[PDB]
């Protein structure tokens, strides 16, 4: 919200400086995004009085005769250029910010133009440039420098959180600075009303949308441009003056965050009717935009006899037709409180965001209407010499705020402060509360405008802030946590250790968007996502990932394309989605492999990974083995499942060739387990100090058989006294049958208490040869 320092300083007279105000608003709950000086007006621009505007024949231009102290003429193509208004005359030799090159005497369509009459854009007071500024013809003595009556201003840019719609009005904002001890000056709308009947009737048909609706009646109006202080103020706040009436409505709105709108009675008909738009009805709003109306739009309509037409999009923006102009003498002033939701909906339905809707959405004082009507009516009487009526037209009877039980004891308990009761009650009373209490728990009833104060905690907040969060002391709580909180962080320290361990061996951690490309569902041969999005950043990021590798792999391609990593071992721990959210660990190997920077002999591929992985769970002290399984995304030749502590939890293999080919990628290996990994409790076990009888023994087996089944069998029948095992060599050669291979194991037996005799080992080494036969294997 733009906050013109001087505008504020009008309600809060003693403000120190734009700087201090920002410091002040800071502690109050509003931070300023920026501060800036705004109306640098060179000495070259003076006030002038359009004596006469003469149309240059043949052109669309005008020769203006202006009283600029002495008389001068200027040429202008501005439609709004007419006789009897004041203007910002830039004399020849003036340096304008808005158009940088030096203004001077120039001949145009036959007339020695003496400088030019500026426009909002040209003076640098607003972005508008479709007309000249329009000052009150008698604004200043012809020729006086404009700055002399239009000083450089300072505007703060304040962030106004939703819990402070009262703050979308400087008089409201001002009320907070007051509580800090700043003198407050509320304008005293000085009305001179006349007890006479209103020429129109009110007929609120949707009290649900217009909980409180009031209409004013000002007549015998003399529409003209606003005085400079008004025009200057509106501009600093980001708005452009338009006249007498319209300006006072906007002024008040900004002042007390209460949108209002002057409807011209010529168009009001018999009376104003606040109803919903008849599904169909058309309305051309102020922006010149011709719109259709959704039957849910709350309309401000007028009726004539048996007719009914819209006049304005209630709470959002007035209608183009009934807006007040120069030839208007009487108006019907709208000042109401509209259903926040209705406005919200409608505003967006028509893609409109006004100063009006913005406030009606956030929240309007449920009982600030009438005071507002007088402020506007007063001002209209003073700037438009209007003759305000005495009676309003109300529709709705809102109930003032209820009391809130407030214990300054708790305030100090909840804050860790020890503010004396007195300071608290005092503050609360400065923010406009009624503290009807005796102690210890008072009956605090807040101001109609504080929508953010319903609870006793709300109130305690008011003390902290007005007292200064910087006054709340530092401390540290000490207590024994409830028992169901012990060890709650195991799941965490577990996974963390994990990562840490991986990062040990050599894996590079990697984070990847939870998003998934629906296409990759086919591209990597996976099942389509169950959770999709209703608002994807991009179809590529349309669904939620069901695996971690599609990404791990993609980050690879992307690497090899920006840089060409000769090799890469990666890993990622992330949340996957599918039936249920579940944590996964993913890995990825690729490149030359591990060996000697020189000596061509490299160690890599599938078994390099299974290498690390076995080495991995080795570290975690967990059972690990792979058992070939078909996985639609892995080379059929190299693809199995992973078995941690006996239970299956993922897979390990090489990416399906057909795939690598599409993503134009070399061969690659990976795995993707599911967390949390099994939990094996440790059982210490004293190791025997008696020598381990160990013997070798090959096992001729048929080529199709997996080393897994072989060992499983050998170890099994190998007996309990079996310490180790091991596979020191696999041979598929000459002295062996067709389609066969021998697995030479290095066994090792051992007894706890005493040494063992070879008569025992044989009775075992044999038991291993017997089942090795009963099954169907040889024994070289």
């Amino acid at each position: 919200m733009r906050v013109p320092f001087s505008w504020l300083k009008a309600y809060v007279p003693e403000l120190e400086s734009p700087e201090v105000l920002e410091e002040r608003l800071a502690g109050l709950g509003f931070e300023t995004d920026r501060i800036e000086r705004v109306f640098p007006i060179p000495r070259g621009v003076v006030f002038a009085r359009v004596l006469e505007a003469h149309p240059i024949p043949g052109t669309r231009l005008k020769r203006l005769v202006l009283d600029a102290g002495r008389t001068v003429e200027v040429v202008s193509g501005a439609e709004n250029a007419r006789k009897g208004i004041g203007v910002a005359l830039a004399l020849p030799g003036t340096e304008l910010p808005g158009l940088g090159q030096k203004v001077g005497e120039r001949v145009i369509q036959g007339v020695r133009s003496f400088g030019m009459a500026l426009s909002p854009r040209e003076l640098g007071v607003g972005e508008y440039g479709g007309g000249l500024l329009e000052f009150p013809e008698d604004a200043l003595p012809p020729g006086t420098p404009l700055s002399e009556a239009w000083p450089e201003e300072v505007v703060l840019d304040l962030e106004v959180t939703p819990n402070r719609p009262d703050a979308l009005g400087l008089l409201g904002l001002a009320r907070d600075l007051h509580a800090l001890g700043y003198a407050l000056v509320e304008p005293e709308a000085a009305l001179k009303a006349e007890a006479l009947p209103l020429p129109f009737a009110l007929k609120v048909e949707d009290p649900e949308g217009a909980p409180h609706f009031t209409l004013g009646y000002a007549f015998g109006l003399r529409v003209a441009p606003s005085p400079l202080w008004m025009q200057r103020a509106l501009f600093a706040a980001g708005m452009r003056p338009i006249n007498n009436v319209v300006d006072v409505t906007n002024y008040v709105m900004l002042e007390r965050a209460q949108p209002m709108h002057a409807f011209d009675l010529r168009f009001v008909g018999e009376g104003i009717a606040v109803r919903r738009a008849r599904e169909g009805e058309r309305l051309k709003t102020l922006d010149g935009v011709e719109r259709t109306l959704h039957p849910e739009d709350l309309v401000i309509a007028g009726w004539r006899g048996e007719e009914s037409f819209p006049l304005g999009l209630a709470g959002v923006m007035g209608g183009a037709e009934s807006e007040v102009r120069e030839d208007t003498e009487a108006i019907a002033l709208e000042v109401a409180c509209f259903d926040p939701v209705s406005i919200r909906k409608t505003a967006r339905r028509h893609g409109l965001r006004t100063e009006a809707s913005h406030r009606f959405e956030r929240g309007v004082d449920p009982l600030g209407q009438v005071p507002a009507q007088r402020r506007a009516l007063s001002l209209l009487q003073a700037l438009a010499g209007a003759r305000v009526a005495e009676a309003l037209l109300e529709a709705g009877s809102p109930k003032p705020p209820e009391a809130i039980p407030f214990r300054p004891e708790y305030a100090n308990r909840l804050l860790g402060t020890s503010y004396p009761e007195a300071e608290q009650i005092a503050i609360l009373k400065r923010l406009g509360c009624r503290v009807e209490g005796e102690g210890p728990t008072y009956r605090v009833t807040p101001p109609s405008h504080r929508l953010d104060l319903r609870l006793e905690e709300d109130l305690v907040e008011e003390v902290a802030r007005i007292e200064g969060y910087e006054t709340i002391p530092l401390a540290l709580p000490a207590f024994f946590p409830a028992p169901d909180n012990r060890a709650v962080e195991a799941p965490y320290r577990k996974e963390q250790r994990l990562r840490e361990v991986l990062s040990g061996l050599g894996f590079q951690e990697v984070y990847t968007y939870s998003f998934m490309d629906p296409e990759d569902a086919r591209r990597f041969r996976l099942d389509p996502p169950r959770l999709l999005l209703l608002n994807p950043l991009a179809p590529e990021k349309a669904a939620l990932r069901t695996h971690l590798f599609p990404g791990l792999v993609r980050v690879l391609k992307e690497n090899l394309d920006l840089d060409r990593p000769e090799r890469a071992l990666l890993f990622e721990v992330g949340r996957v989605f599918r039936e249920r959210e579940e944590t996964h660990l993913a890995g990825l190997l690729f490149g030359e492999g591990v060996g000697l920077p020189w000596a061509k002999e490299r160690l890599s591929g599938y078994f390099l990974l299974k290498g690390y992985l076995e080495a991995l769970f080795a570290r975690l002290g967990l059972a690990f083995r792979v058992e070939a399984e078909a996985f639609p995304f892995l080379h059929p030749g190299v693809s199995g499942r992973v078995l941690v502590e006996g239970e299956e939890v993922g897979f390990l293999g090489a990416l399906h060739p057909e795939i690598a080919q599409e993503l134009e990628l070399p061969p690659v290996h990976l795995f993707e387990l599911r967390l949390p990994l099994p939990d094996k409790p440790l059982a210490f076990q004293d190791p025997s100090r008696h020598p381990a009888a160990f013997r070798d023994l090959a096992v001729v087996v048929p080529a199709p058989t997996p080393y897994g089944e072989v060992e499983a069998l050998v170890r099994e029948a190998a007996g309990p006294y079996l310490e180790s095992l091991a596979l020191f060599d696999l041979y598929q050669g000459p002295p062996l049958p067709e389609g066969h291979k021998s697995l030479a194991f290095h066994l090792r037996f051992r007894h706890p208490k005493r040494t063992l005799r070879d008569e025992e080992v044989e009775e075992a080494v044999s038991r291993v040869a017997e089942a090795l036969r009963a099954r169907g294997f040889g024994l070289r």
């Binding site: 012990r486 599938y606 002290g621 080379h635 030749g637 190299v638």
Partner: protein, 336 residues
């Protein structure tokens, strides 16, 4: 084979181009009926048929060799990278430290070779001290050895091997100022015949919390927390009076081990003794530092790591830790 079947793109390109974009191009557009279309045709009739055919041809030629060739016994042992592990003493220490870390304690270490001043004197254990016999001091002899005290200054005195970590209480206080919470793990050495539950070289864990307002209730709370974290909610601590020259209201403590229904005696404890505070500040003057432990109080505690470890990991005999057996160690690869 397509490697060339690709290059043919210019073999067919430029060559065929020597028909249209090579035969008067500033007039070719004025000739469009048939001839141009001859290429517009062949240019399409060839690019699609050719370039793609050769592709998909090999796309099913190369991708075919692999699918068939590459056949591995997945369940076959892989590269034998090494798999590390951590000593049991460390697994424990770490957990103890993480336990006290959560209570706001700082973990700092001290030297193993101390001076008779920090190990005994500053701790209130003067010469021929009757109470100087719970520790069986290892005396050292070495010229050219530079032992250095807290403020990096050269500390004098008869060198030895600290018989407990408590001397880190004296050192850390002349260095820092209160309030603070410290736990200082460390290897200590004593002269006693070893057995199933005894060593000559073992580890302790000091805990020192100095500060104004510190009470024995706070000392008891710590142990109560040490207890919980180690044996769950169903755990409880037991404090019984005992003597140490450096803590007046002294105590020995035990933690209740539910999963075993037995009281374990962990360590000593108590409120820091008046003369240790005196010895500290007193030492500081000597070093020109203002006194700092005049208006404070504080508690210390010291426990046997191994014994906790033993009971905690089930190691029957204490002489295993420093044994060196890989068959023993490797057992703990995975305690997290």
């Amino acid at each position: 084979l397509e490697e060339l079947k690709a290059l043919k793109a210019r073999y067919l390109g430029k060559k065929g181009l020597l028909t249209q974009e090579m035969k008067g191009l500033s007039a070719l557009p004025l000739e469009e009926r048939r001839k141009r279309g001859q290429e517009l045709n062949a240019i399409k009739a060839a690019l699609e048929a050719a370039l793609e055919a050769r592709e998909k041809a090999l796309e099913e030629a190369a991708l075919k060799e692999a699918l068939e060739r590459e056949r591995v016994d997945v369940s076959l042992p892989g590269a034998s990278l090494f798999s590390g592990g951590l000593h049991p003493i460390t697994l424990m220490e770490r957990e103890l430290v993480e336990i006290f870390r959560a209570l706001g304690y700082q973990a700092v270490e001290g030297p193993e070779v101390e001076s008779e001043f920090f190990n005994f004197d500053a701790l209130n254990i003067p010469e021929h001290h009757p109470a100087r016999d719970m520790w069986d001091t290892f005396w050292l002899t070495g010229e050219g050895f530079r032992l250095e005290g807290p403020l990096g200054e050269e500390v004098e005195g008869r060198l030895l091997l600290r018989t407990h970590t408590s001397p880190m209480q004296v050192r850390y206080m002349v260095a820092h100022t209160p309030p603070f919470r410290i736990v200082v793990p460390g290897r200590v050495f004593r002269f006693e015949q070893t057995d199933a539950t005894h060593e000559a070289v073992f580890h302790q864990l000091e805990g020192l919390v100095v500060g104004e307002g510190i009470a024995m209730a706070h000392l008891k709370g710590a142990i109560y927390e040490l207890a919980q974290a180690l044996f769950g909610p169903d755990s409880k601590v037991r404090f019984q009076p005992v003597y140490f020259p450096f803590v007046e209201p002294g105590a020995q403590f035990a933690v209740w081990w539910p999963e075993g229904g037995k009281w374990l005696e962990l360590g000593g404890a108590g409120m820091v003794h008046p003369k240790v505070f005196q010895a500290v500040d007193a030492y500081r003057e000597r070093l020109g530092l203002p006194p700092a432990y005049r208006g404070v109080t504080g508690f210390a505690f010291g426990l046997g790591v191994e014994r906790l470890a033993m009971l905690r990991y089930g190691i029957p005999d204490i002489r295993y830790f420093f044994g060196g057996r890989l068959k023993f160690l490797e057992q703990f690869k995975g305690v997290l």
